[PDB]
From a paper:
[name] glutamate receptors (AMPARs), the primary mediators of excitatory neurotransmission in the brain, are either [name] subunit-containing and thus Ca2+-impermeable, or [name]-lacking and Ca2+-permeable. [name] glutamate receptors (AMPARs) mediate rapid signalling throughout the brain, and orchestrate various forms of synaptic plasticity that underlie learning. These cation channels assemble in various combinations from four core subunits, [name]–4, with each contributing unique gating kinetics, trafficking and subsynaptic localization. AMPARs exhibit a modular architecture with a two-layer extracellular region connected to the transmembrane ion channel (transmembrane domain, TMD). The ion channel is encircled by diverse auxiliary subunits, modulating receptor gating kinetics, pharmacology and ion flux, with the transmembrane AMPAR regulatory proteins (TARPs γ2, γ3, γ4, γ5, γ7, γ8) being the most abundant.
Numbering used by the authors:
A (entry chain E): 5 to 42, 55 to 84, 92 to 162, 173 to 210
B (entry chain A): 765 to 773, 784 to 823
C (entry chain A): 422 to 519
D (entry chain D): 520 to 551, 569 to 764
E (entry chain A): 569 to 666
F (entry chain C): 569 to 617
Amino acid sequence: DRGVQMLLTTVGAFAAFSLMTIAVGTDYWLYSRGVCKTEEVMTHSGLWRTCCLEGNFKGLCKQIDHFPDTAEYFLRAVRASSIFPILSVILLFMGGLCIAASEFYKTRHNIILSAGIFFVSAGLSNIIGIIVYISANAGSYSYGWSFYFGALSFIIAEMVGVLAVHMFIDRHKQLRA
Amino acid sequence: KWWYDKGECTSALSLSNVAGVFYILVGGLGLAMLVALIEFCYKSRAEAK
Amino acid sequence: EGYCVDLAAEIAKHCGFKYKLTIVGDGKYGARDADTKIWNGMVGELVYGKADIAIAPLTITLVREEVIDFSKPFMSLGISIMIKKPQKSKPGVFSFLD
Amino acid sequence: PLAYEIWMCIVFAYIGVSVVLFLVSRFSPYEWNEFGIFNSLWFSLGAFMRQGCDISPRSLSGRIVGGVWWFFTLIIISSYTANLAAFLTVERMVSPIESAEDLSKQTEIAYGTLDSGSTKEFFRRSKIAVFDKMWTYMRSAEPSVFVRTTAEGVARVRKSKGKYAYLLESTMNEYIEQRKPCDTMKVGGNLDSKGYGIATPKGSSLRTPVNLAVLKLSEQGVLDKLKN
Amino acid sequence: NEFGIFNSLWFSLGAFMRQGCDISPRSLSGRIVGGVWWFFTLIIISSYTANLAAFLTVERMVSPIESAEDLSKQTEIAYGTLDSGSTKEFFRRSKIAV
Amino acid sequence: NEFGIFNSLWFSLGAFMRQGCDISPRSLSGRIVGGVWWFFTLIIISSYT
Ligand SMILES: CCCCCCCC/C=C/CCCCCCCC(=O)OC[C@H](O)CO
Ligand SMILES: CCCCCCCC/C=C/CCCCCCCC(=O)OC[C@H](O)CO
Ligand SMILES: CCCCCCCC/C=C\CCCCCCCC(=O)OC[C@H](O)CO
Ligand SMILES: CCCCCCCCCCCCCCCC(=O)O
């Protein structure tokens, strides 16, 4: 049912982009038990700031110290600059931009394919980011709602990519008629 | 003063033990997408005009 | 400098004497050679009168108390085991080929 | 056998592989590959469970996707079986409490000392943070965590299903550990170092002879023979 | 549907991952090659799983040092004392079994 | 053919012995049944070994 497909894909693109951006900006990725700004108390650590709670001076927090065998150096570099979560954000943004431009300069029916490719690639970058994040954390705990916002952005991005590719296939099917 | 004031100091398998296989999988998915798009661009440019 | 350097200055002030710190020549604590029966280390320096007092982590033992005098303990302790930590290993990325 | 993160990332990789196989198989108008999104998901699931194929990609790119998914599946299922074999071969039971620090940081397991003794006084006067924290808890715990006799503390440990730990001298602990039903265990190192002595009234005539006798029994090895 | 070079490579790869075949050889020569490759694959993948299980099982029954009793009952970890000292004498004279 | 009672018993037996398929369900309900049976088979055979 074309028409409602466009609304569903646009809503999905916006939802995935918003969720991934909130996940990156927010810092509730890991409920560890460590030191706040320089006693061990809980903390809502994130991608950038290991932030404190239930402590003497809860709410005051700092920037995670990423650095204290080139393999460890490369992984620590890739996890310090969240290149993969940030690349996921950029690719979702460009996918949404292509979907929006699919109304102007219509009849190309070759940019909506680019939207599908961008959403799929955003999902792949997101999963690599999760893997590096969890692997670097291994150098009791739990995962916060920022982690699951990233994961849900991955799922919605993959669905929106499948819809975009379906719409591209349908458009070339109409053209072939 | 001399000891502490100047002190300078699971069973399941973890994702780290297998992370390499995930990296290979996602790299292979990316390579597959690149190959498919290269072939599509080749065919789309090979139409007689 | 050190715990015993700080303690030596204080023992000397409270006992009213001037003193000179000297490092035991053989760098040992003190044992009686089974054979020559000579005492070495800081215990030997006191037994043969090379030193007037030893201010060090010198353990009060029966065999030493038989040949030298010891104050009441200034530090309580016991033999212990020192090990290299375990140092959790980080698995390699391509460790599934091992 | 596999950490929760491995399962979660297996599910993410499943969705990603299925979507990329659907995209690559049917996106170019020149291919128009029976891999729709539903059939892509079925192929990926059946590949992971090492089950029937019934359809195999024929393109170069669909074959790259299939091949890396097959490798991933082989490694992950082999490692699940290997780690389950490891779990079943050598069983190991975890002792909730490792050291005193452990007792201090938790509250599910109660712990106490002889109601009257040098152990209770050690805690009531400790200036060490962990022991002061343990004393703060023990002196205010209700019901009382203190016992009238060592045997009472041993029985409370034995009958509390692991909800009561008992602080007592290593000597008594080591002895009870060698007593049936062999259901107790000494955990961690000693919290302090001290000694038992023969006591006499202040100024007693027996003080010097009994001090010398203890040293004689010590030096002749009698005290080690009697402990053994 | 027939074994050209690309289809031959796909068949071999799929046979190695135990991932079933969309087509199998039909001639005596093709079937000899397929059967031998299937045997090779079975032995190699079984051996991979068995050796990974050995690695994890052996690494799981390891145990560290927690006491002097532990040091006494083993020999992989060496242990000693200051060559001259009250610790060495404690051990040279101990009447305690461990 | 399609899954009659005899063919469904054969599909299930072949799934448990990890001996692949000659047919597989094509509908959503058949595929849910097949999926849970495949998971069950994998856990049980791995646990036996
Ligand atoms: C027609 C078929 C289409 C193609 C199908 C492809 C699927 C097969 C891929 C397998 C994994 C390959 C990657 C193996 C990993 C290599 C990593 C490595 O060599 O690690 C070095 C290590 O650090 C020590 O030197
Ligand atoms: C295309 C058709 C699709 C077919 C679909 C076939 C289904 C295959 C998978 C089944 C297992 C999934 C259930 C896994 C449940 C895990 C249990 C759990 O959640 O763990 C509990 C808790 O986390 C710990 O205490
Ligand atoms: C229908 C056509 C099918 C064609 C057939 C395909 C091949 C069969 C598969 C494997 C053969 C394995 C051969 C095993 C050789 C064993 C060697 C051996 O036994 O030597 C050990 C020695 O006895 C110790 O002292
Ligand atoms: C091929 C895709 C699906 C395969 C089946 C995988 C099962 C997924 C389970 C996910 C949740 C696992 C939770 C385990 C952790 C725990 O017990 O705390």
